Design a binder for this molecule. Structure first.
Ligand code: NAG
Ligand code: CA
Ligand code: CA
Ligand code: CA
Ligand code: ZN
Length: 409
């Protein structure tokens, strides 16, 4: 079932730029002693990376903050509300000052009940929900590290089905790995593709974690494991004349020649990246130009996707469904029922007749000539046709208007 390109995507090293926060209670538990706590955090991330090796993820600690003064959220024995408060704090307070793919709260409070942490599921790189929360419940750093690794498994799309698999043979059950993978394949989140700059990492270099840090030139693991002719495993220095070791654009300790491909296209709105002969790094993932016809002329590319009404229906509604006929979209001429184009001022605002395909999305099943739509008292964008969907020949949605593509891109 998995396309060869999917299997191969499954094997690209992936990275998380991780930020950890220590709350006031763990801080006091550790006698206010800030180097002791930083050390224990570094043991912890190291433990994670040892566990996440077989998964192809490397966790790079890019920030560590201790609330040695007061908590900036109300941390509560109720695990849910602390996870809720911490997710909002991440989105509103942490991201504006500090890029990161993920953050965990590590806290000394005693959570009510059995719960030692909690996480949102398959949400990595999400501003809102790429966050977990972990209780520092033991003096044994390995154990808290394991829970930390488990709450991150949740962010990476592993399910609770927990209390084990259906059936089989520190680590993850096979069912937890298929879940995680499916999630990666289904969402392919963007952020875990970039290799963080070695400068950006705040933990001590570890020579042997397979990630090249400041003061190292290569890192192929333990001397017992390493079999590179390029790298000296003990010292993490390149060998005689080598320019590189295990980067995607290295071959036989040298830069590959220009134009060798290094990240395949994942579909027709992706542009392949190609090695430079100039360095050992694969150029950043970028995509085809905005407006390229895509998915058999059914759409036009927008920032690396091919938005199509039928697929947005299926995403909202599950497979088995498809876009409604054009007549359904008339409803968008008014603001009663599903009908919508824009929120302006907290007021509801109709589509002009010419724009009706860039308002609320209308889907259908069988029997149903009923025009179904998706709504949210919560979030007035949910169910709205995605920007950049095709609305006529050579026309796309931009700001909830149907516009000439030559004016959009
Ligand atoms: C690693 O580097 C040192 C330089 O101190 C060298 O003499 C040592 O034997 C090297 N080890 C290997 C296995 O190349
Ligand atoms: Ca990233
Ligand atoms: Ca290293
Ligand atoms: Ca690309
Ligand atoms: Zn668990």
């Amino acid at each position: 079932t998995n396309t060869p390109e999917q299997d191969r995507y499954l094997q690209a090293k992936k990275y998380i730029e991780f930020y950890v926060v220590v709350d006031n209670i763990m801080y006091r538990h550790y006698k206010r002693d800030q180097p002791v706590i930083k050390r224990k955090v570094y043991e912890m991330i190291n433990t994670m990376n040892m566990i996440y090796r077989r998964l192809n993820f490397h966790i790079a600690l890019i920030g560590l903050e201790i609330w040695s003064n007061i908590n900036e959220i109300n941390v509560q024995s109720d695990v849910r509300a602390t996870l809720n408060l911490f997710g909002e704090w991440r989105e509103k307070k942490l991201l504006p000052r500090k890029r990161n793919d993920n953050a965990q709260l590590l806290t000394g409070i005693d959570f009510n009940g059995t719960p030692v942490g909690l996480a949102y599921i398959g949400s990595i790189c999400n501003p809102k929900t790429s966050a977990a929360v972990v209780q520092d419940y033991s003096s044994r750093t390995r154990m808290v590290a394991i829970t930390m690794a488990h709450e991150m498994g949740h962010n990476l799309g592993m399910n609770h089905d927990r209390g084990f698999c259906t059936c089989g043979f520190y680590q993850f059950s096979s069912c937890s790995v298929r879940e995680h993978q499916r999630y990666l394949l289904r969402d392919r989140p963007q952020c875990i593709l970039n290799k963080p700059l070695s400068t950006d990492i705040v933990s001590p270099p570890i020579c042997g974690n397979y990630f090249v840090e400041v003061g190292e030139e290569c890192d192929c693991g333990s001397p017992a494991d390493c079999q590179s002719a390029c790298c000296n495993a003990t010292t993490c220095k390149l060998q005689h004349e080598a320019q590189c070791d295990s980067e995607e654009c290295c071959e036989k300790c040298k830069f590959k020649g220009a134009r060798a491909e290094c990240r395949a296209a994942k579909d027709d709105c992706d542009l392949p990246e190609l090695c430079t002969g100039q360095s050992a790094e694969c150029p950043t993932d970028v995509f085809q130009r905005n407006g390229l016809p895509c998915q058999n002329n059914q759409g036009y590319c927008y920032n690396g996707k091919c938005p199509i009404m039928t697929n947005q229906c299926i995403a909202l509604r599950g497979p088995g469904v498809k876009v409604s006929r054009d007549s359904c979209f008339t409803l968008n001429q008014r603001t009663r029922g599903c009908g919508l184009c824009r929120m302006e001022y907290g007021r509801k605002i109709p589509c002009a007749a010419k724009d009706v395909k860039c308002g609320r999305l209308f889907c259908k099943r069988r029997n149903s000539m009923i025009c179904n739509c998706s709504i949210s008292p919560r979030d007035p964008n949910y169910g709205m046709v995605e920007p950049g969907t095709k609305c006529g020949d050579g026309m796309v949605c931009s700001n909830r208007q149907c516009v000439d593509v030559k004016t959009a891109y």
